[PDB]
Symmetry: D2
Amino acid sequence: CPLMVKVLDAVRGSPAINVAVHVFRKAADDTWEPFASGKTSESGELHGLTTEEEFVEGIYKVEIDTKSYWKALGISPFHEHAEVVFTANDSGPRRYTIAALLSPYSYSTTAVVTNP
Amino acid sequence: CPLMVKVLDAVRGSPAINVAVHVFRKAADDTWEPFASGKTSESGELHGLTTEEEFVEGIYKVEIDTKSYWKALGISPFHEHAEVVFTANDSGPRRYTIAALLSPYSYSTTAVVTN
Amino acid sequence: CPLMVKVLDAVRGSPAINVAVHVFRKAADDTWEPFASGKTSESGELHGLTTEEEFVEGIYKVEIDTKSYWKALGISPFHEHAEVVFTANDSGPRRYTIAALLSPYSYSTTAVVTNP
Amino acid sequence: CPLMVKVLDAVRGSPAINVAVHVFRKAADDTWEPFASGKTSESGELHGLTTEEEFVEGIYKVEIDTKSYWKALGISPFHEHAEVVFTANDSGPRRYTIAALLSPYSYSTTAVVTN
Ligand SMILES: O=C(c1cc(O)c(O)c([N+](=O)[O-])c1)c1ccccc1F
Ligand SMILES: O=C(c1cc(O)c(O)c([N+](=O)[O-])c1)c1ccccc1F
């Protein structure tokens, strides 16, 4: 509930389905620790990545594997991935939606942050 | 010099070339009067639309013929066109760039206003 | 159900609430007939604009009143509104989400079109 | 000439000036090695990062220090930075512009790749 990822396809006008997403958290030693991962559903959404207990304060990286998505639709794309890096929960728990809108040579990303 | 339009293609990663662009000025009766038009260049840009003398304060609409652009590339698009409607304000900086980034089902637009 | 509008605020990282939206449909005589209107909710969404019976084939214009939104947050913005113009339902009924992401000097819009 | 970065501000409608930009090249061991860096100019652009000789095929990362930019304007932003990661490909056009459009809680990036 506290972290959701939504991915849209600007070419098709559709959810981006089956997009791999890997989340990392920065460790004490400044490495990126694997935190959670999953795939977008037929709605373009990925729920169930973490829990409010697990999703502590930290610096998180949400890596959206855009290059496999375009390639398996016959578009050799430009980017390797889209990386979204942010501090979370540093004023207490929040709910985060990380959205991405994909094109072969472009993407946009936004965050919607709500206080439960 | 006061108004430039720039159009980019997010599918090909390129300028959007030969895109028709029409600029209108809102009239006193609230209708849109033709003001300037042209086709984007090889660089995706359209310069020479107006002059400082002619580009007075008011409400302008820039209509970008995105549907024809996509059609000519053999791609089916969503929008009829992209319209950008704004007020020219003499208190702000003097040069306006209206940029548009096109995808078949999406577009982005921004204004870069400088002195 | 067949037409939904969602508006997000890129400055706040939040839904854009209380945004006025006016929908028009192009008439036979090429004028823009008022079709429906409403305001975004606290989720940034506007539902209930039309019905599948009413939402016939045509050219529709969704006008999102971005300039009142920025102004009532102390930002004099650049655009008068964001206009989204599209042909709908010309291959039978579809469900349309028109999304807009707003900044004071920029916006993006996308469509998600699904076949029920 | 082969690589330019352009950064724009969607809140002010302006170039994003004095933004730190770091470019890295992916090494054989999968670590990121510093490649080029600079600060955007008054036009929001950063030219002179590399030369045709040095800019060989490979995976590059462009990291744009968006957090410091927003902080210096007294605005609280969401992201730590914006990272753009791509492969340089000799089969495609020769000149790469990496553009970024910044808002506090959002950014857009596109590549304009030309000959
Ligand atoms: O359009 C976007 C967006 C975001 C959402 O959270 C969302 O629910 C929907 N939507 O349903 O279409 C759309 C968007 C996503 C990423 C970056 C820029 C964007 F404009
Ligand atoms: O990417 C954009 C943009 C703008 C410019 O003015 C420009 O010179 C370049 N560029 O050279 O790539 C790119 C852009 C355009 C419109 C809306 C959102 C955007 F991100």
